[PDB]
Write a protein that binds this DNA or RNA. Structure first.
Lengths: 206, 60, 100, 98
RNA sequence: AGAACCUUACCUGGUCUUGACAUCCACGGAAGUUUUCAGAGAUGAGAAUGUGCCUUCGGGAACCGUGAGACAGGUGCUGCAU
RNA sequence: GGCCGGGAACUCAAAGGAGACUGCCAGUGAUAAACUGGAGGAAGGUGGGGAUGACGUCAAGUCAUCAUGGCCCUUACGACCAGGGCUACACACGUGCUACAAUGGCGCAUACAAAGAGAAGCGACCUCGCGAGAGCAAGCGGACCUCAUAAAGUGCGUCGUAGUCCGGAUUGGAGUCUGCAACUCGACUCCAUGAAGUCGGAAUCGCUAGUAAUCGUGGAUCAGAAUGCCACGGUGAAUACGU
RNA sequence: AUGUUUCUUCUUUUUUUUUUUGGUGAGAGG
């Protein structure tokens, strides 16, 4: 009942959007829903590839797809082999020609999404979260992050009630608009319901 | 003769004069009184609504 | 909503583009200052010959992401709960907090 | 005379994006009728932030759509030749007005 | 952020069930489009006309029907399982 | 007629900076922080407003946005259609609107906005129409066109403390458009009608300034359907001894 | 002045990359 989205309110001064184009009022919904299925199917196609963010830049009558991953080879396949299979079907989904492009991140222990789905892979294979979420914290503290808070929630540990636990290490100034924060969410479906994970990673200034 | 240029709204046309030559587009608006057709060209993706004369463009 | 409900919409989409807006001249011209005898009776009644669920007034308004009935927004074309999570994810090109 | 109407979201990009077509038109026509301000629409929205009751909690969202004009004066037959298919700034929807 | 029908999840009643909607397999039928209609409508009985691409022409893709099912579906209960 | 040449300072417009930081002065204060006045200044003690909501609290609300562990139905609680109901009515409460009139109502003349919306959409103008609207159709996929000729305000005439040129619920009749469809169950309009009510008991709420109050406009929703909600600007107060 | 009963626990082991300047004509030497 508090704490509005970190990636929500920085979008005019710090972090850019994840879909940068302009379309008028007649085709604004048509552009938006097509973006929703190219984010759905691609994350479905590249679940294990450890993809963090996807940038969708449409210069009209075209779409530039960007994939930010920690596993470059699995994304591109074998020299672009899987990408041409996507090229036939990404253009089939959005109904427009697709110029697929690939980016990368060097440090997955500093990218919020990559930290979050790691605990998702941990907690769905029945491991103890107390040293699994401690693992992700001590990872980022020595990888260059100035501070990181990791939160897990749900009925973790097979308990009846929903025991919630959060843990931080270092600066995490959520209120400061000058403070860049990498934040993302992931959820884990065990047989004990859904366990959601939320992690904040603070880096610095403008 | 080759003088095809008549284009109503939503009709595709052809440009063969000026930098827009060798390009096709549709006439969203027409102006018979001003003798000018409002057609945009798909230049670098974004439609480039430009006014071309009937002889400046050909009917598609 | 319901997978049953989302199927009825696309079925009523198929009626609104096949019959209506194409066979809409049944009321456009022939139910006006034209022959106002009982040939104009054939204008209003042949409009009933087309199905009831074919009118664009019948296609209510539903979200495209999840299909929620209420709280729709025409610009984004999807429901109010879905426009906000995509706002904070950074999906709609330009929505920041309006703090004027 | 030959108007060029610009449309974008990123106002910090459009001043350079118009500058990218200023330099493309400066070396060709040498007379361009300025980067006119052209006021921006502020499409205001409001959304019930809750998935349920308590219609007191709302969030307000807006989209400043910025416009510009370039307005190439003279139609010398080399100016537009350097413009068509030779533009940039993916995400900035451009249009001519003539 | 707006129930005349729709919405609609409710009631009376008329109908239908591998189905309102999805993936998979079998055989036929292109798909489509127009018209007479049983009835309140649904659905069903039909009647014309069309029968496009790939040619691996002993068959795929696009798509409708029929059959078997593994299932699909649920605004059904539990917000103190989440 | 800024209508036309023409002008680039101006309003306005859209970008980037300047600017207010107890920076300067005086008293006060432990040479402290800081407070109370003064100067210069558009703005002065966080200038005004807004977003922003610390661990946790109610094991608060949502399984009906959606996601999901169980649990359960699967010729069914699933599905399809027509009509009805969600609007039903002894009664009580919540929240608003219109008023109870004379700083007021009706008629005539006339002044002054902002913001936002617009393509199977907004609709000039002229024309038939008492009216709702209809016909033909400019322009505009938009600082240009249109919705859109703002309201109190003022000047004047006028009624004369009355249930009445106040108020207008309800009711009968004749119609306007939306839409397959207005009966249950739309809004609006014309003619007719004329209620309660004459400033409200116990009790309770909002507000410290361009605020309260009052007036008119726009918008999302939307085929159609606001007095609501969200935004805008016009007019413009009283009081704050004090804990 | 009054406000029913009974009524809620913790592990400490878990974690691979990385990519397979030609032709033609003439002359000459062996």
């Amino acid at each position: 009942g508090q704490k509005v989205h970190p990636n929500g309110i920085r979008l005019g001064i710090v972090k850019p959007w994840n879909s940068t184009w302009f379309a008028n009022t007649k085709e604004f919904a048509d552009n938006l829903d097509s973006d929703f299925k190219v984010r759905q199917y691609l994350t479905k196609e590249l679940a294990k590839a450890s993809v963090s963010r996807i940038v969708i830049e449409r210069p009209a009558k075209s779409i530039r797809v960007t994939i930010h991953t920690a596993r470059p080879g699995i994304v591109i396949g074998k020299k672009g082999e899987d990408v041409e299979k996507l090229r036939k079907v990404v253009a089939d989904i959005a109904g427009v020609p697709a110029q697929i492009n690939i980016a990368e991140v060097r440090k997955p222990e500093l990218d919020a999404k990559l930290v979050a789905d790691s605990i998702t892979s941990q907690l769905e294979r029945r491991v103890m979260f107390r040293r699994a979420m401690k693992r992700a914290v001590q990872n980022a503290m020595r990888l260059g992050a100035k501070g990181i808070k990791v939160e897990v929630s749900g009925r973790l540990g097979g308990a009846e009630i929903a025991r919630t636990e959060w843990y931080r290490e270092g600066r995490v100034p959520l209120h400061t608009l000058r403070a860049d924060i990498d934040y993302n969410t992931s959820e884990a479906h065990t047989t004990y319901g859904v366990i959601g994970v939320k992690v904040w990673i603070f880096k610095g200034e403008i | 003769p080759r003088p095809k240029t008549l284009f109503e709204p939503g009709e595709m046309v052809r440009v063969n004069d000026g930098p827009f030559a060798d390009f096709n587009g549709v006439v969203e608006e027409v102006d018979y009184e001003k003798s000018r057709l409002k057609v945009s060209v798909s230049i670098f993706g974004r439609a480039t609504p430009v006014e071309l004369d009937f002889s400046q463009v050909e009917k598609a | 909503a319901k997978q049953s409900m989302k199927a009825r919409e696309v079925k009523r989409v198929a009626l609104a583009d096949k019959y209506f807006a194409k066979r809409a001249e049944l009321k456009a011209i022939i139910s006006d200052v034209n022959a106002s005898d009982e040939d104009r009776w054939n204008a209003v009644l042949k409009l009933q010959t087309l199905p009831r669920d074919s009118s664009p007034s019948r296609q209510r308004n539903r979200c495209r992401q999840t299909g929620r009935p209420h709280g729709f927004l025409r610009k984004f074309g999807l429901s109010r709960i879905k426009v906000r999570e995509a706002a904070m994810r950074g999906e709609i090109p330009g929505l920041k907090k309006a703090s004027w | 005379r030959i108007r060029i109407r610009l449309k974008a979201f990123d106002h910090r990009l459009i001043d350079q994006a118009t500058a990218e077509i200023v330099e493309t038109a400066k070396r060709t026509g040498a007379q361009v009728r300025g980067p006119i301000p052209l006021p921006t629409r502020k499409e205001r929205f409001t959304v019930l932030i809750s998935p349920h009751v308590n219609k007191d909690a709302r969030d307000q969202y807006e989209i400043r759509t910025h416009l510009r004009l370039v307005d190439i004066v003279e139609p010398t037959e080399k100016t537009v030749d350097a413009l068509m298919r030779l533009d940039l700034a993916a995400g900035v929807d451009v249009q001519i007005s003539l």
